[PDB]
Design an enzyme around this catalytic site. Structure first.
Site, short mmCIF file in Angstrom:
data_model
loop_
_atom_site.label_atom_id
_atom_site.label_comp_id
_atom_site.label_asym_id
_atom_site.label_seq_id
_atom_site.Cartn_x
_atom_site.Cartn_y
_atom_site.Cartn_z
N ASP A 35 0.83 -1.20 0.00
CA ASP A 35 0.00 0.00 0.00
C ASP A 35 0.87 1.25 0.00
OD1 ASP A 35 -1.88 1.94 0.32
OD2 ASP A 35 -2.51 1.32 2.33
N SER A 199 -0.51 15.55 -12.09
CA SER A 199 -0.72 15.17 -13.47
C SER A 199 -0.97 16.43 -14.31
CB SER A 199 -1.92 14.22 -13.56
OG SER A 199 -2.28 13.94 -14.90
C1 LIG Z 1 -13.81 -3.00 0.49
C2 LIG Z 1 -12.53 -2.82 1.23
C3 LIG Z 1 -11.50 -1.97 1.12
C4 LIG Z 1 -10.57 -2.28 2.17
C5 LIG Z 1 -9.29 -1.64 2.48
O1 LIG Z 1 -8.38 -2.26 3.06
N1 LIG Z 1 -9.19 -0.37 2.05
C6 LIG Z 1 -8.03 0.41 1.88
C7 LIG Z 1 -8.14 1.64 1.24
C8 LIG Z 1 -7.00 2.39 1.08
N2 LIG Z 1 -5.79 2.01 1.50
C9 LIG Z 1 -5.71 0.82 2.11
C10 LIG Z 1 -6.79 -0.01 2.32
C11 LIG Z 1 -11.10 -3.32 2.85
C12 LIG Z 1 -10.66 -4.14 4.00
O2 LIG Z 1 -12.31 -3.68 2.28
#
Ligand SMILES: Cc1cc(C(=O)Nc2ccncc2)c(C)o1
Ligand SMILES: c1cc(CNc2ccc3c(c2)OCCO3)ccn1
Ligand SMILES: CNCc1ccc(Oc2cccnc2)o1
Length: 330
Positions: A35, A199
């Site tokens: 991430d 951008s």
């Molecule tokens: C539907 C969904 C999205 C996520 C989720 O982890 N979001 C996310 C969003 C942005 N950065 C890191 C993580 C989960 C557990 O379920």
């Protein structure tokens, strides 16, 4: 040193990507969501509330001869979509694709929110934004990349996400066989802790390119492309029957449509997202209304170049003294 690991979509929609990570001694392999929009490495663990574990692989620090409790340290994080997790902290040896960091903070979940429990394929997150966002208290911890950087051949990592296919995260080198043409580098602001860049504009399908500055973040942990309402409206206006649905939570379109591409600017260069990358399928099983992969950022407070955009490119996260971002077609 370098590392290289394959990243794989969790489902047929590319909703997220998982990458195997070795933790502890002997190794415990967990599949983590890398991430670039957050800065915590956290895992499902032997400490996670039992009712909140549903199929995930867990890290058990008591089985690792190199694990050490980071005494007094706790963590708690909430992501932009309302999900969250929290717990305590160990240090342990962490390896990604052959690259090893000793003493990495491994944040062990005691609690996770329901959408984490529901994703049996995601064993935790590995944050790759700047360490200033790390949530560990009272002593903030460094990301895996931050800890590895000095040992890498070059202070970089790259994201090469696949469309309906596996891809690669590389650390410490740029695979010159993985992209076409040249890599265009662009400035980054680290002031909000993100890989934040501007951008230079966009085009819809075969339309003329609109030169306009769009600040946003390169975020592998966000599925979709979130852009200003004006840009998003201009895109969906080219799709017969597309509409913004308050009940569904965004733009939907007839599943029978063939979507136009979307181009974004990186300096004088252009990255083209094919239309099929923007199709997230039926809004509910069997529906003929499909969910769009380009959505408005209004109310988020930031534009997000998530997986929909990044998977159209080979992306360099350059962690040199002044960080920058590079994009190439592929
Ligand atoms: C539907 C969904 C999205 C996520 C989720 O982890 N979001 C996310 C969003 C942005 N950065 C890191 C993580 C989960 C557990 O379920
Ligand atoms: C994008 C996709 C997802 C999960 N997939 C998905 C697919 C279609 C959808 C959806 C969700 O939620 C709204 C209705 O249609 C979760 C977060 N961002
Ligand atoms: C969280 N359960 C529902 C679900 C399945 C797939 C997805 O989509 C995700 C999952 C994790 C991160 N980003 C998007 O949500």
């Amino acid at each position: 040193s370098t590392g290289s690991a394959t990243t794989t979509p969790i489902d047929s929609l590319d909703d997220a990507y998982i990458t195997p990570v070795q933790i502890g001694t002997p190794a415990q392999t967990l599949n983590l969501d890398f991430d670039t929009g957050s800065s915590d490495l956290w895992v499902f663990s032997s400490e996670t509330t039992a009712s909140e574990v549903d199929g995930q692989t867990i890290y058990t620090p008591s089985k690792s001869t190199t694990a050490k409790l980071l005494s007094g340290a706790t963590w708690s994080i909430s992501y932009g979509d309302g999900s969250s997790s929290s717990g305590d902290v160990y240090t342990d040896t962490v390896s990604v694709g052959g690259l090893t960091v000793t003493g990495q903070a491994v944040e062990s979940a005691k609690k996770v929110s329901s959408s984490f429990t529901e994703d049996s394929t995601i064993d935790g997150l590995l944050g790759l934004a700047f360490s200033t966002l790390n949530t560990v208290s009272p002593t903030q911890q460094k990301t895996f990349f931050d800890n590895a950087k000095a040992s890498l051949d070059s202070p970089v990592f790259t994201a090469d996400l696949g469309y309906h296919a596996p891809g690669t995260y590389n650390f410490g080198f740029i695979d010159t066989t993985a992209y076409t043409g040249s890599i265009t580098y662009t400035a980054v602001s680290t002031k909000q802790g993100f890989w934040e860049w501007t951008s230079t504009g966009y085009a819809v399908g075969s339309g003329t390119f609109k030169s306009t500055s769009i600040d946003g973040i390169a975020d592998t942990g966000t599925t979709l492309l979130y852009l200003p309402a004006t840009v998003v409206s201009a895109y969906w206006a080219q799709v017969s029957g597309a509409k913004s649905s308050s009940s569904v939570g965004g733009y939907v379109f007839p599943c029978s449509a063939t979507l136009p591409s979307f181009t974004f600017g990186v300096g004088s260069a252009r990255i083209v997202i094919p239309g099929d990358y923007i199709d997230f399928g039926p809004i509910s099983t069997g529906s003929s209304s499909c969910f769009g992969g380009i959505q408005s950022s209004a109310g988020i407070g930031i534009n997000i170049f998530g997986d929909v955009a990044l998977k159209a490119a080979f992306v360099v996260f350059n962690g040199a003294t002044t960080p920058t971002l590079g994009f190439a077609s592929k």
